[PDB]
Amino acid sequence: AGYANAADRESGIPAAVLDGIKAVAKEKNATLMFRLVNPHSTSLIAEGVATKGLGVHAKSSDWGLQAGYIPVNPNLSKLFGRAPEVIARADNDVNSSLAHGHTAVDLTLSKERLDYLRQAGLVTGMADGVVASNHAGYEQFEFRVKETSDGRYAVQYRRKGGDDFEAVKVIGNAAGIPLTADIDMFAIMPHLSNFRDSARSSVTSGDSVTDYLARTRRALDRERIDLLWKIARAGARSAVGTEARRQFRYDGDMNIGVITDFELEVRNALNRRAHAVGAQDVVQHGTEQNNPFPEADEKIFVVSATGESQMLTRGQLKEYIGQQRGEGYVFYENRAYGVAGKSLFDDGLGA
Amino acid sequence: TDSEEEIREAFRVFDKDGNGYISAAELRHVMTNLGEKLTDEEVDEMIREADIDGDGQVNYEEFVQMMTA
Numbered sequence A: 001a002g003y004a005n006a007a008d009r010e011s012g013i014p015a016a017v018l019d020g021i022k023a024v025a026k027e028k029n030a031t032l033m034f035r036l037v038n039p040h041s042t043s044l045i046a047e048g049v050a051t052k053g054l055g056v057h058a059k060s061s062d063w064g065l066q067a068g069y070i071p072v073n074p075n076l077s078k079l080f081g082r083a084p085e086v087i088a089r090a091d092n093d094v095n096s097s098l099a100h101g102h103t104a105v106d107l108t109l110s111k112e113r114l115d116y117l118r119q120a121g122l123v124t125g126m127a128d129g130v131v132a133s134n135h136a137g138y139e140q141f142e143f144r145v146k147e148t149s150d151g152r153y154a155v156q157y158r159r160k161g162g163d164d165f166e167a168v169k170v171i172g173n174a175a176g177i178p179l180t181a182d183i184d185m186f187a188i189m190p191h192l193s194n195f196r197d198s199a200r201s202s203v204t205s206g207d208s209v210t211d212y213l214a215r216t217r218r219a220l221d222r223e224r225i226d227l228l229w230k231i232a233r234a235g236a237r238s239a240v241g242t243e244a245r246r247q248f249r250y251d252g253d254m255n256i257g258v259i260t261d262f263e264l265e266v267r268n269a270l271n272r273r274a275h276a277v278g279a280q281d282v283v284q285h286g287t288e289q290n291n292p293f294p295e296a297d298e299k300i301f302v303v304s305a306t307g308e309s310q311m312l313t314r315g316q317l318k319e320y321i322g323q324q325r326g327e328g329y330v331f332y333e334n335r336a337y338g339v340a341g342k343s344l345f346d347d348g349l350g351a
Numbered sequence B: 001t002d003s004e005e006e007i008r009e010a011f012r013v014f015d016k017d018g019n020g021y022i023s024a025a026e027l028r029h030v031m032t033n034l035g036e037k038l039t040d041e042e043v044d045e046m047i048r049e050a051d052i053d054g055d056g057q058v059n060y061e062e063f064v065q066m067m068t069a
Ligand SMILES: Nc1ncnc2c1ncn2CCOCP(=O)(O)OP(=O)(O)OP(=O)(O)O
Pocket: A053, A054, A058, A059, A060, A181, A182, A183, A184, A256, A257, A258, A259, A285, A286, A287, A288, A290, A291, A292, A293
């Protein structure tokens, strides 16, 4: 259907991609929560631009024809008139990314994006291709673009009354596909039934308790109750991915962050739908519940296991989680939330 | 030998409702979800088995105990 309400539209997630998200959330019976996607990224993501992993710390740009991309020249990124000591901190970030698979690439936009930019007010007309803008970033840099018999426009620029122009360089895939922001998941609340097989392969053998006992034992049952608690322990332990969160996971040569087995499934299932719709990988790492640098945005986009979407304040988020847990959906919180007095749990919270 | 923060996350899976205790009803739900259909009597047996202090429910310390093996 695409977007079914305001939430979906304010999420910043391209509609086709979002369609897959809602379908996955239902297929794997799991509530999926995401942090907002910057609207300048929404269109790049849909025409198939690549999404960035944790191996990229350079900062995006929010202005000019380069908005949505990650500039090699930090003065072209959101960090425009900062300190010289920040263009440096920023200079290095970029450099740590090109030494590692990430490439330098000549920015070229598609027609459609050129439209989006102009209709967004980011780029105020141009000569017949010599852009204008009211961003202070235009009181120091000069921009222009030159189409190609390829339909795409090559972005170029120069320093104020300081002479030749040159293509703006943007960080791309190892494959040189430019990168825009990725879709950060806030958390994944898997329904507990998703861990039956997981508990059985750990305790019995794959077998139900009844089948396992008939098989290995012989014609109040202390044994049977113990084995029942054993799958209960193993079930929650898998659900919360206790063991998996002790290490980092890698996707090929890309550090995926800390992620449970089930969360990895979700990620793969999501990126699969993204590919089927023209996109490339959109979820590049684990959940915010495992982020050491916990960020505190205050609005969260939520897609329930039933397909229903909405936005939530931290407060509506506590009750939501509480309501959801009542229905058997498991949730664990970023370990540093408590010590800062921001836990979403209202329990003893301790031992 | 999980850590204390590790065992509390797991504990929360069982403790569906607000309070820091596992009741028979919450345990029946976990068991059904994990592939085991049990009677009120079987559920009572599992809670009794873990209920050290005898209050009808499994608290955090009691959980910490047997989740050994
Ligand atoms: N599971 C995780 N493990 C490790 N780091 C994580 C994890 N989840 C998130 N992070 C780190 C940063 O979050 C994502 P990322 O998509 O980089 O953010 P960003 O919002 O673009 O940062 P910026 O505005 O500082 O550029």
